[PDB]
């Protein structure tokens, strides 16, 4: 029961996506060594609310206590903005912003690397993003979700990394999570054939080591089961008549906003 967004609806996604991508533009300057994840959440929430005049879709969603998730190193997802957590040299850092504005969600996230990169997180972060872009490039009317998922996996495995299975991109709209599920791997289960006007996310979680994850005592923080690094990027898109438009693109992104397969 995939909604097909209207024109007016799609225009609201664009706004909401820009909003969400703008939070992540805003925050980069403040992503330095010595800063606290607790501090960043403070910063993004103030902005979301006061400046952007939007709400976090994070906050109180299943009891989520903070306004953005911010995962570090071997934290895979849903890390908790913690006033005592500080960023060190060498850290790979995901911050996931999801925003509602005028009743539509925008949902995006990115890796920041902090101070002096290391070769390994410099790399895992690169593949992770290329595995998103690869997939972004496949989206068009009549392709199957299954193809996309299979493709992300191969890319990712060929580099000696694994795709986290527990999480998936998703339908998005008036709801955070809508059909379809966007698995980032192959499944006889998946058989979705895309149509002009579906909105959804692509957001592969990629581990440097093995694909097994583990939730912490706090009920929230997911880690690598082998403490290997993990990394994620996410975008929201609309399928178009000839391809896709990416609705949460940033100035720092290197793929076009509009993507066409037509002649
Ligand atoms: N699937 C997701 N893509 N972006 C997000 N923020 C996603 N999920 N967030 C979840 C999922 C379950 C429970 C709580 C959250 C929260 F709060 F981080 F948003
Ligand atoms: Co997100
Ligand atoms: Co998402
Ligand atoms: Na991580």
UniProtKB/Swiss-Prot annotation:
GO terms for molecular function: ferrous iron binding; initiator methionyl aminopeptidase activity; metalloaminopeptidase activity. Monomer. This is Methionine aminopeptidase. It catalyses: Release of N-terminal amino acids, preferentially methionine, from peptides and arylamides. Changing residue 177 to A: Reduces activity 9000-fold for the Co(2+)-complexed enzyme. Binds only one equivalent of the divalent metal cation with affinities identical to the wild-type enzyme. InterPro entries: Creatinase/aminopeptidase-like (IPR036005), Pept_M24 (IPR000994), Pept_M24_MAP (IPR001714), Pept_M24A_MAP1 (IPR002467). Substrate binds at residues 78, 98, 177. Keywords: Aminopeptidase, Hydrolase, Metal-binding, Protease. Removes the N-terminal methionine from nascent proteins. The N-terminal methionine is often cleaved when the second residue in the primary sequence is small and uncharged (Met-Ala-, Cys, Gly, Pro, Ser, Thr, or Val). Requires deformylation of the N(alpha)-formylated initiator methionine before it can be hydrolyzed. A divalent metal cation 1 binds at residues 96, 107, 234. Belongs to the peptidase M24A family. Methionine aminopeptidase type 1 subfamily. Its EC number is 3.4.11.18. A divalent metal cation 2 binds at residues 107, 170, 203, 234. GO terms for cellular component: cytosol. Disulfide bonds: none annotated. It is an enzyme of class 3 (hydrolase). It comes from the Bacteria. Its cofactor is Co(2+); Zn(2+); Mn(2+); Fe(2+). One of its GO terms (biological process) is proteolysis. Binds 2 divalent metal cations per subunit. Has a high-affinity and a low affinity metal-binding site. The true nature of the physiological cofactor is under debate. The enzyme is active with cobalt, zinc, manganese or divalent iron ions. Most likely, methionine aminopeptidases function as mononuclear Fe(2+)-metalloproteases under physiological conditions, and the catalytically relevant metal-binding site has been assigned to the histidine-containing high-affinity site.
């Amino acid at each position: 029961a995939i909604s097909i967004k209207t024109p007016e609806d799609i225009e609201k996604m664009r706004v909401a996506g820009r909003l969400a991508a703008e939070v992540l533009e805003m925050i980069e300057p403040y992503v330095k060594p010595g800063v606290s994840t607790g501090e960043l959440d403070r910063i993004c929430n103030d902005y979301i609310v006061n400046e952007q005049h939007a709400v976090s879709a994070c906050l109180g969603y299943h009891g989520y206590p903070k306004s953005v998730c911010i995962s570090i190193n071997e934290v895979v997802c849903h890390g908790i903005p913690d006033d005592a957590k500080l960023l060190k040299d060498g850290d790979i850092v995901n911050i996931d912003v999801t925003v509602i504005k005028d009743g539509f969600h925008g949902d995006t996230s990115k890796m920041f690397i902090v101070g002096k990169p290391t070769i390994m997180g410099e790399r895992l972060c690169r593949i992770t993003q290329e595995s998103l872009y690869l997939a972004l490039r496949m989206v068009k009317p009549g392709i199957n979700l299954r193809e996309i998922g299979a493709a992300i996996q191969k890319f990712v495995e060929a580099e000696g990394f694994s795709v986290v299975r527990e999480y998936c991109g998703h339908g998005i709209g008036r709801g955070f999570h809508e059909e379809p599920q966007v698995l980032h791997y192959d499944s006889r289960e998946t058989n979705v054939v895309l149509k002009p006007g579906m909105t959804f996310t692509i957001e592969p979680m990629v581990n440097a080591g093995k694909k097994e994850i583990r939730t912490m005592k706090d009920g929230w923080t997911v880690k690598t089961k082998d403490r290997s690094l993990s990394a994620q990027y996410e975008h929201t898109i609309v399928v178009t008549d000839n391809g896709c438009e990416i609705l949460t693109l940033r100035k720092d992104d290197t793929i076009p906003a509009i993507i066409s397969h037509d002649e």
